[PDB]
Every structure is written in structure tokens, then in C-alpha cells.
Amino acid sequence: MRRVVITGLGIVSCLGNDKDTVSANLRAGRPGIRFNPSYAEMGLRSHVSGSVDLNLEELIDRKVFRFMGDAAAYAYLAMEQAIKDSGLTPEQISNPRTGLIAGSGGASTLNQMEAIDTLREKGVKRIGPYRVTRTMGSTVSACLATPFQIKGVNYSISSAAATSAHCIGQAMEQIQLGKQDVVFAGGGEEEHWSQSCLFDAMGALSTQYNETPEKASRAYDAKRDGFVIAGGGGMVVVEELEHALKRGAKIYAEIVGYGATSDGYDMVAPSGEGAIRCMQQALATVDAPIDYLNTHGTSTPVGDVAEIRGVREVFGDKAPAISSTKSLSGHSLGAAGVHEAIYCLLMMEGGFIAGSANIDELDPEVADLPILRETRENAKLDTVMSNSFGFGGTNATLVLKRWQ
Amino acid sequence: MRRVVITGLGIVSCLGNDKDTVSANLRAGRPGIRFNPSYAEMGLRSHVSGSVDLNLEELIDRKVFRFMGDAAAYAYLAMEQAIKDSGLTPEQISNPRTGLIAGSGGASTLNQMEAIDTLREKGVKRIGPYRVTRTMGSTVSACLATPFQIKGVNYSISSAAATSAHCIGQAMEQIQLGKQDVVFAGGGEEEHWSQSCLFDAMGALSTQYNETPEKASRAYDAKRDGFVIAGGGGMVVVEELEHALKRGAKIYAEIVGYGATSDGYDMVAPSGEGAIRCMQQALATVDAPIDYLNTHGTSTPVGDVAEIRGVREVFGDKAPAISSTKSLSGHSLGAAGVHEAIYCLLMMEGGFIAGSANIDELDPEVADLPILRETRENAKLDTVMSNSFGFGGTNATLVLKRWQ
Ligand SMILES: [Cl-]
Ligand SMILES: [Cl-]
Ligand SMILES: [Cl-]
Ligand SMILES: [Cl-]
Ligand SMILES: [Cl-]
Ligand SMILES: [Cl-]
Secondary structure (H helix, E strand, O other): OOOEEEEEEEEEEOOEOOHHHHHHHHHHOOOOOEEOHHHHHOOOOOOEEEOOOOOHHHHOOHHHHOOOOHHHHHHHHHHHHHHHHHOOOHHHHOOOOEEEEEEOOOOOHHHHHHHHHHHHHHOOHHHOOOHHHHHOOOHHHHHHHOOOOOOOOEEEEEEOEOHHHHHHHHHHHHHHOOOOOEEEEEEEEOOOHHHHHHHHHOOOEOOOOOOOHHHOOOOOEOOOOOEOEEOEEEEEEEEEHHHHHHHOOOOOEEEEEEEEEEOOOOOOOOOOHHHHHHHHHHHOOOOOOOOEEEOOOOOOHHHHHHHHHHHHHHHOOOOOEEEOOHHHHOEOHHHHHHHHHHHHHHHHHHOOEOOOOOOOOEOHHHOOOOEOOOOEOOOOOOEEEEEEEEOOOEEEEEEEEEOO | OOOEEEEEEEEEEOOEOOHHHHHHHHHHOOOOEEEOHHHHHOOOOOOEEEOOOOOHHHHOOHHHHOOOOHHHHHHHHHHHHHHHHHOOOHHHHOOOOEEEEEEOOOOOHHHHHHHHHHHHHHOOHHHOOOHHHHHOOOHHHHHHHOOOOOOOOEEEEEEOEOHHHHHHHHHHHHHHOOOOOEEEEEEEEOOOHHHHHHHHHOOOEOOOOOOOHHHOOOOOEOOOOOEOEEOEEEEEEEEEHHHHHHOOOOOOEEEEEEEEEEOOOOOOOOOOHHHHHHHHHHHOOOOOOOOEEEOOOOOOHHHHHHHHHHHHHHHHHHOOEEEOOHHHHOEOHHHHHHHHHHHHHHHHHHOEEOOOOOOOOEOOOOOOOOEOOOOEEOOOOOEEEEEEEEOOOEEEEEEEEEOO
16 A cells, blocks of 8 residues: 655644744643633633633634634644645645545534524624534534645544544545545644533543642643643644655655554443554554554543553553653643644654653552653654544554654 | 445434335425424524424433434434344444444534533533533544444544535445445434524525425525525445345445545635536446436525536536435435435435425526426436535535445
8 A cells, every 4th residue: 555654744732833842842841731710710620721822813814714713723823834844835735636634522612602692692693604614513624625725635533532643544544545645634622611611510620730730630640630621733744655755745754553443332431442452453554663652641540541551451561661741731632633643753853752741659550561751862763653542432543653 | 446335224304214204205205394483482584494303312221312412312313223224233233343434514502502501500510421422523423333332443524514425435435445344324413593593694594485494495496595404313334245245234225436525715605616526536436327416405596506517517418317305304414415325225225216396496597407396206216426515615425326
């Protein structure tokens, strides 16, 4: 089958809105989590978030921006970065063999709330004509494919925390089917109390670290108490290898493995069994040893351990270095898969492994695995794996191999 | 390349909640559209909908149903029907080589509204722990994969009106990649004023027929005035041919063509050009003449004609018989693609072409095309085509060939 590489990236996140800032914060171990006054004012129990600090209206053409909620807007800025990074020409961006596969976990709870408040107070006409494109499940793909004049595939995948990892794997598969040469893959996620309250109510979020927000997300720590919600966007340029070499592309990495499985077990907790099969499917096409695993690792009591049990079954006594970057970044939901793919690309480009932050007391149930608690500098980091596991028992695993 | 057939179906719709009732209403030309008092009470300008008449809480065990909104519930009941219809065994349904690809355009605006009303009036805990799975973009896949113990692929696609057509085509592609043998493909969509108001506010919906609701959806009629929103669910069993033959499956049709393209131009306005490329891509793998085209045909002034311009460019003087079944069913959004695939399968089983209803005066801009205004009985239907075109310039076309 045709080989597939990544030739450009872009990111909007609480760790930074450009690759150099994000790389630096991963290397230094600086969390992007902050206190969220709006959460406290609205009666949430979790008062922490990984929030993006941007004036989106000053960064995006108004004709484009009117159709967007924050999820699309974050993804759009990430895509602009990825296009610049990749050096693709307008004709390489806009042609039947170049596509877009990008999604979100939610869409825009804020625009939905505004629409209904408006209906009740002011009537239907005052809702305005832009709410469907901001709130539909395809908001991220629709709002990007249209202004970038994408002519190839155009759809969104939604698979909760697996969303943007499935997007990248499906971009690879569209190229392997022979249907596309270039696919923009990624995701976006709005961060607002109108979405975070739903997670608070199901008992998913951190609450015990509201006074020390930078410490709240602490995968593998004995005092972890739920995930820290986040927003943002990411996009990668997925490209067929011969196309990339012929145009003199920069090549970060080859996509060498991809798994997508289902637990068929519990709506909210991983089975561990599905994750084992997902990692094995990703590894079935990989000959090189795995140097680093970026876990799903959300800072939840059950989930962090269940995934580690699966890692132990897959690798036995030969596990790779492991960290969760969610201890720094929080959980960007639909954006988590592409964010973590990007973090892994930046680690390989920079020759370092980000440590698993905020571990005061390593959970004894994971202490036999090589959980990296500090940055590994001067790392010969060639082959990396990232897991993304969402509600509904949906699993995604990507394996990337550094291009020399 | 592996061949792909459809071996089971299920449907929840305003035309019926079983395939025999639906087939009868298609043949007789009986619309499912009714007056919606809640729309009028809430100040919408459109007072018509295609609504499902089911007591969902009597049909789905509460332990399953608590995680669902209506979109997932409709899809679940369609999947129960498709499982019975297919004759698959529990070991064939729950297997690493059996997957689920099913989505929605929205998810649950009703559950979002209830959650925020509850947060404001009663606080965060009273929202309850079920709202994320009801409202997340992957609600339809998550809420089915878990109880049916799906082990293979598991994710949603969201692409507006193309959603469940892309689900079917991607199910076909997973089988062609060699990754799955059976994939449940389809979609679901909630119908509620909290979603319909968004479409009303963009000027998309019919308003001139509120006193005569069954006449409101009237694709190609000179006095069409917008689409009629609907809800429901549909699911088809997409299966590798040798697997189907070995297990003695019933076989409706082979999937012989699939297109998926992007306009890369208008967020909402119909393109003509993207539709031409999508139909050509579907037809590139088809040698048989097309006997029938089920258009997207939403009963919009511009959209109906833009699509017919594309059909004229693709087929010229050899255009197939055409009808829009949306004049009967309304527009089920995320469920439209699988609903119309099912209607086409039922037309091939019954040897009839459903008439394009409610045409008092055929629009002169489409009158040169063979738009059937009445049901054709004793129709020799071997190869049928269905278009689904969504906001964001997303396009799908499926071509199905009757299995003799
Ligand atoms: Cl396990
Ligand atoms: Cl998660
Ligand atoms: Cl939609
Ligand atoms: Cl309470
Ligand atoms: Cl006629
Ligand atoms: Cl539409």
C-alpha cells in the first residue's frame, strides 16, 4: 500500500498557539491550566480549565468567522498554520485529490444556548441565520472545507476523545485507498461552562485543586480526581510519500500504524480489552521498537489504571517510556488526538520526551511501568505511539516514525 | 477488491417504523408530514414536521435508554430491526471483524436545553449523569456500539445531510481495506423545536403550507418554499460478499458505486459542480444503466434546480427516472442518507418507483427531466442511485444494484 507521512502542523491550545511555544512548554513541563471564574460563578464544582487565550474575531476573516463557533475557529487557525508550515501551493490545497477530515466532540453548546435564549426572549428571526453551521456536528469540517476551497473528501468524524485521532487514521486510509494524495486532518473543541457543566454533572472533572489549578491534572498521581476540560484546535497535513518527496516537502514522520477498535462494554469506563486490541492493531504494521507512548491518561482514578493494565498486556516487561501530556494540557476532547499527535511530532523534532507532570505520589497500581516523571532531554526518539480512547468504548492508536 | 452487499435493514420514520409500512407509503404516495403544535407555540414560522410516533421508553430497556437522546434511540431501534432482518448471530454481531459507523447531523438540542435550564434553576448536580452521552457528536455510535457489544470499528461521521450516506460508503471502504467483514451503517436524528428553530432562522423551512401540512414538502413543484424537517433512524448491514454467501444471508443489493466530494465554495447555497463530480465518481465504477435516481431534492427553490442542472450535465438525454422521496418523508438530516438508501432498496424489492409527490405544476426549469409525478408500478429496477448533499459543501452519492 502507499506510504503516508505528515508534512505540516498547526495548533491552538492552552500550551500555546504556535509550535515553538507548545514545544517549549512541553519541554519545561509548564501546565496551561488556570482558574476559571465563569465556572465558579455558574455553580460548577470544577473551577479549572485549559483555555485558549485569543481574540478570534481579530484573527479570522469576518465572512468566514460568521459561520463558526469556537471549535471551527480554533481548527481554522490551526489549518492556516499547517498550510504555511507545509508550503503547499493554492492548487495543491484546492483540488479533487486534496481533502479534509476534521471533527469535534461537541459542536457549540454556547451557540445553542444563545439561540434558545433568543427564541424565548426575542423570537425565531432574531436567532440569526448562522447558528446551524456553528452547532451542527460537522461544524469543523464545513467551516474549513468551504473557505479553503477543499474539493476532495469533506466530512467530520465524532468519536468523543478519539475524534481527531480517527480523523488522522482515516486520512491515512483515504490515501491508502488511492482516493486522495493530501488530507488535512484534525479537530477543534469549544471550551465553555455550557459544555463543561455536563461533564461536571457526570462526575468526570477535577474539583479538589481549584485553589492550585496548575496541579489539578495529574495522571498516575495517587490524588488524581478527574480530568481538566480544555479547548483548542489542531491540524496536520497527511500526504502520500511520493507526492511529498516530489514537491520537496518537509517530512516530520511517517504514519506506520493505526488502530481503531470498540470495547462493547461500558459507556464511560474503558474495558482495557478494547485498548489492547487497538494497540496491537496499530503495532501489527510496525517493525521498530516503540520509544515512547503518549497515553490517553486523563487523570481519572479508573481510566488511568485500566489503560496501564492494557499497556502491560501489550508490551509485557518491555514497555516504552510513558507519559500523559494531559497533566500539562488538560483534556481537549475532540481536539485531544491531533493535539497529542502534534506533541509527539514536536518531541521527535526536538529530541526530548515530555514528562508526566504533577506526580507527587505515583499510584502503586502503575509503578511497575516506566512512567516518565520529568523531561527526558537528549532523547533519541524515533518511534512514538499515542492512544486516544473515548466514551462509548471507542479506541484509536497512532504510531509515528521520525523521518530522517 | 472485496465485493460489498447489503444483507439487512431497519427503519424508524414518519413513513413507518417497519420496512413493510414504509414500502406501502412510498408506493401509495402518502406523506408523513403533520402539523406540529409545539412549533407554532414556540413562535417558529414553519409549523410542519416529519415526526416519529413511538413510545421509546416502552421499546428500549431503561439501562440502555438512559444514555440516549432520541437520535440514538431511533438508530438503536433501526439496528434491532436490521439485526433481526439480517439473521446475524450474537457471535457474528460481537466480533473484532464487525463494526459500527453511524452518526447524526445534530445530537440532542433537547437534552442541552434541559441541562442548561437545570444548571440555572437547580444547580449542576441535578443535570444528572447522562447528558454527555445524549448530546455528544458520537451519541449514535456510542449508544449502540456499547449495548450491542461491538468490537470492531466504532465511530460517527457528521456531514449534515450527507451523514448517513457517508456512513454507508465508509462501511463499504472498511470492508474493501480488508479490516472488517460486517459493518452496521446508518444514522439517527432527533426532531424537536430546539433544533428546528435554527433552520427556521436561516430561512430554510417551508412556511406557506402550515394549514395543509401533507402538501408542504413538494420537490420540483413551482410553489415549493423550503424543506420540511424530520427525525428518525435507519440502519443497514453492510457485508463482505463471501461472508454473506457462506452464512446464507439474504442479499438486497450490491454497493457498486460511491462518491464523496466537497464543493469548496458555498456554506449553504447549492453548488451544481460538486454534485456533478460526486455523481461522476459514484458512476465511474458502474457499467449498468441507472434505472432510478433518488435525488437530494429537499423542496427548496434554488437547491432543487441546482441538483437537476447537475443531473442534466451528468446524464444528458439518458437521464433516469427521478423522484424525491422528501416530498413524502421530509428531511431527516443525519438520517436522510440511510433512509433514502432504504427507500431505494424497498423500491427494488417491490418493483416500483415512488412518485415525486405534491407536484401541482412542474417547475419549468426542471420540466425536460423525467421526473415521475406518480408511482411507476411493474418497474424493472436493477440499478438505483441516491444523492445526499449537505451544508458545508459535503456530497455523497450511492449506487446500489439489485441482487438477483
Ligand atoms: Cl483488561
Ligand atoms: Cl475521555
Ligand atoms: Cl446537520
Ligand atoms: Cl442537589
Ligand atoms: Cl409523470
Ligand atoms: Cl440540505
